Amino acid sequence: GHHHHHHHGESLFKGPRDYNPISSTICHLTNESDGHTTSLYGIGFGPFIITNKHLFRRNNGTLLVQSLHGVFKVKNTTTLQQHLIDGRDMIIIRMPKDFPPFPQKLKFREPQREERICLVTTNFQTKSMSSMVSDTSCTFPSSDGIFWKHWIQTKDGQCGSPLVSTRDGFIVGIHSASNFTNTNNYFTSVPKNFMELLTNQEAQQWVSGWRLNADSVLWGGHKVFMDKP
């Protein structure tokens, strides 16, 4: 809608960016437990998969993990080591040694007010998984900065997908939720010093068997329900 004028060459929108290094690390996760099944996405980094804490509403079954290297199944989710991100819908799963690790080239940082972001995903139904990038939205913190607002259309099942800065290609958060009318979307922001956490074992606090115990939670100033209506 905007016709530019009185510009500098540097004022133009950023040119093509290769999002394949990010999409090639995305995994599709299915936690099947107690008659329920929850599916959403995660981001691989080394031996870790970064995903939504609500994946673990339940923790008493199996975890199917679809990635670039194929499909792997964790027989008992309670054996998985987990690192919780305090007060955010984010958790890090440490995969067992027999799961092929991911590279460690991705960069994560806290989002910046008003910056332009896009949502990146991977299509697994195609024989060969294919990378997907959405149109661009600006972003702002909702409250204390735990959840950030975004205006990218997302379908059910895309939680965990990375929100990426078109400015520097860094991942600034993961998709988490919407209001009841699907008119405002929210992602969970990457916390401060996240790169330190991913690369310094002293900073990690691993537990196993952890789950949520309710159908709604109060994070970042919002009450969030597990299911809509």
Place this chain on the structure above:
Amino acid sequence: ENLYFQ
């Protein structure tokens, strides 16, 4: 506002 995990 109230939100729901998607």
Place this chain on the structure above:
Amino acid sequence: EATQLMN
């Protein structure tokens, strides 16, 4: 088909 990890 899914590779069953060791658990």
